[PDB]
Amino acid sequence: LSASEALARRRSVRAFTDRPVDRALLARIFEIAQRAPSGGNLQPWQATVVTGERWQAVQDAVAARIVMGREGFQPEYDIFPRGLTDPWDSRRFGVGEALYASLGIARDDKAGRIAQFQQNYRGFGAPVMLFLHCSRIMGPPQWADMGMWLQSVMLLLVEHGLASCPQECWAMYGATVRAELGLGDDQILFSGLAIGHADEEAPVNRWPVPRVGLDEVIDWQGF
Amino acid sequence: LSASEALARRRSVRAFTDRPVDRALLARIFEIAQRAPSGGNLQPWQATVVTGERWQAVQDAVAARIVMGREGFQPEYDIFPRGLTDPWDSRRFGVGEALYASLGIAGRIAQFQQNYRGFGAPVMLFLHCSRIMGPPQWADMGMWLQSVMLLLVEHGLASCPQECWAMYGATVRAELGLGDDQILFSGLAIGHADEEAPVNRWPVPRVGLDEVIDWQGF
Ligand SMILES: Cc1cc2nc3c(=O)[nH]c(=O)nc-3n(C[C@H](O)[C@H](O)[C@H](O)COP(=O)(O)O)c2cc1C
Ligand SMILES: Cc1cc2nc3c(=O)[nH]c(=O)nc-3n(C[C@H](O)[C@H](O)[C@H](O)COP(=O)(O)O)c2cc1C
């Protein structure tokens, strides 16, 4: 399977089968992901990988904050820019309507759409959850480094018949997550990555995902 | 060429041939690179791609900043973290001196000079975004950028990501015709690798996974 294909066939998967992931596969995937580039070869990404009931502990501990409502939020950072303007603001809800479409939840059936969202905190039923973090000394370019490593991981997964879903939602409770995991407050939680076998006849995993056209992305000069 | 192979054979290339780059190829590459993920599918990345005489225009303007010594610097942001501790810096010098070893330099600005020539690449990509975007969105840009770099390799092209242009983000933003609504993250030199230049063949170190991955619940 080519890089193009893996890239074409990577999507955020929101339905995993109850099927385990070979730790040997993961370790091998990470060895190659480490070939990701980084400014100054700093390689600032750090990963805690949890499964079973270390992973169940996290879910429960965070679930205990979720029922607190907005009161229980412990944001590591601003997931989206406050006052995100209307260009980007459309892309966010644009896919939202594409994906709730796939499950059957009415457009302003607010109850049901929230119900699908909290599945986030089950890692959509993935057996393994990856927590990507780094030192609080790292700046935005180093966060870009982490993207590069993260995207590598997702492509290798696809290549080896596995799937994933990137999740910033856990940053809503960074401290709780960091606590359960045992990282200190020198560390900052960036994102989670639910890892597992995609349920490829779950409809939540088959609706076509939109991207904007290149005219909104790419400027050409000197040609 | 598989994704594993593509990752394995992507390196920062610092010697490009004069071989021109098919714009049709680049365009196709970007179309599929756009499939990279982004929090909320913001796809916050934007790119200005230059070759020819606008690309020479950018270089000339930055060189004018270079001759200024420290005065000509216009940092978009801070490339490496103030008070980066020497544990992490150890990685930088490990690879840095391995790379200065291959060229013979130890005097070193001559090599650093070559940066702003894009190591002789015919095409230079400038990745930027709105000043409103936060660090998660910068991670998004990373995901797109790594996508682009893997595709170059798969298609027989090569690249070098360059934060050095951020040393003059403002001058560069001017040449590109960008506003101060935008901030420059990085450059990406694009072209065919001069594949028997030795600076393109020395083995690049990575740390072991025991410094990287913690396993729990297994
Ligand atoms: C950093 C990051 C965080 C994400 N967090 C979540 C998340 O918390 N919940 C979720 O459902 N999807 C999350 N996603 C998935 C994105 O919505 C998805 O990448 C985008 O809509 C494109 O869809 P696709 O990846 O399936 O092509 C995240 C993606 C990224 C890059
Ligand atoms: C965001 C970013 C910016 C970079 N900027 C430069 C640069 O300005 N000059 C340079 O020689 N290398 C630059 N690099 C190359 C890194 O030094 C390189 O990725 C790492 O040192 C060596 O790994 P590699 O050759 O396998 O890519 C950059 C890499 C990244 C990810």
Author numbering:
A (entry chain A): 9 to 231
B (entry chain B): 9 to 114, 120 to 231
Give verbatim lines from the article.
Recently, the nitroreductase NfnB from Sphingopyxis sp. strain HMH exhibited metabolic activity for dinitroaniline herbicides including butralin and pendimethalin, triggering the initial steps of their degradation and detoxification. Each monomer displays a central α + β fold for the core domain, with a protruding middle region and an extended C-terminal region.
Next, we determined the crystal structures of the two single mutants, Y88A and Y88F. Their structures were found to be nearly identical to the wildtype NfnB, with RMSD values of 0.38 Å for 428 Cα atoms in Y88A and 0.39 Å for 433 Cα atoms in Y88F. Compared with the wildtype NfnB, the side chain of Arg100 had been displaced by ∼4 Å toward the side chain of Asp97 near the entrance and was found within a ∼3-Å hydrogen-bonding distance from Asp97. Except for these displacements, no other residues at the entrance exhibited any noticeable conformational changes. The specific activity of the Y88F mutant against butralin was 97% of the wildtype enzyme, and it showed significantly enhanced activities toward pendimethalin (90%), oryzalin (47%), and isopropalin (14%) compared with the wildtype NfnB for butralin. In particular, Y88F exhibited higher efficiency toward butralin and pendimethalin, with a lower Km value than the wildtype NfnB, but Y88A was more competent than Y88F toward oryzalin and isopropalin, mainly because of its lower Km value.
